[PDB]
Design a protein around this nucleic acid. Structure first.
Ligand SMILES: [Zn+2]
Ligand SMILES: [Zn+2]
Lengths: 123, 123
DNA sequence: TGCAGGCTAGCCTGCA
DNA sequence: TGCAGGCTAGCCTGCA
């Protein structure tokens, strides 16, 4: 799929993994009208007020891509912002963000610009 | 698990696959009392009238073991009788067999002695 | 007890 | 349209 490569370029085994992660996000957001465009116009315009780009959330919270489970919001900020993003602990959400991680909504925002990075508040 | 090796010996990538198949059959039959013993006393006594050793059946019919889907009754006769067993077509069941493959029962007999081999009736 | 990971039934897709 | 296969949410387990 060219849309996967198209969105990927706007950012080894991790190189491969992010392709397989973006391919599943594209197959997810394709089903919802005006969503893959909304994510495109959000990874290109950085400071401008963006809307929510949301995939369904699991009972667990974790999203599995290519045999690796992990948090969806962490996974996409890891691709489109900080590959060294160690955990959900290093990611607070924006007030503009309607469906954040840690809300129990059956929709979760995968938008890497809807979450600002922080210093870990543990120990 | 030693019970897996214990049952396996009563019969490359196929060598590995049959271990992973017998490990899942053992974890399945362990849960049901007097079942793993019933399968042991059936792969050793060949001609003697054996009882049913049954695992639950899927909506599909297929059993997945180590990334490979396939028919449970085919899978176990492939381990404990004919590794060249090409398909369910080459396997008719015994009249003594209470839960055969092709009955729509939420239990299916994995007993390799409850099914006699045949010549394919197709084309 | 939060975190990580393995296994697979169900679901979806592609194919002759 | 029977047959094969890939992807994963849910489930289960092990661990400090
Ligand atoms: Zn949002
Ligand atoms: Zn039987």
């Amino acid at each position: 799929s060219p849309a996967v490569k198209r969105l990927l370029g706007w950012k080894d085994e991790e190189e491969k993994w992010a392709e397989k992660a973006v391919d599943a996000l594209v197959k997810k957001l394709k089903k919802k009208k005006g969503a893959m465009e909304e994510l495109e116009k959000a990874l290109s315009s950085p400071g401008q007020p963006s809307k929510c780009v949301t995939i369904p959330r699991s009972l667990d919270g974790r999203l599995q891509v290519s045999h690796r489970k992990g948090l969806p919001h962490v996974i996409y900020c890891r691709v489109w912002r900080w590959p060294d993003l160690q955990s959900h602990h290093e990611l607070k959400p924006l007030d503009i963000c309607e469906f954040p991680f840690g809300s129990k909504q059956k929709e979760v925002c995968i938008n890497p610009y809807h979450y600002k990075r922080v210093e870990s508040p543990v120990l």
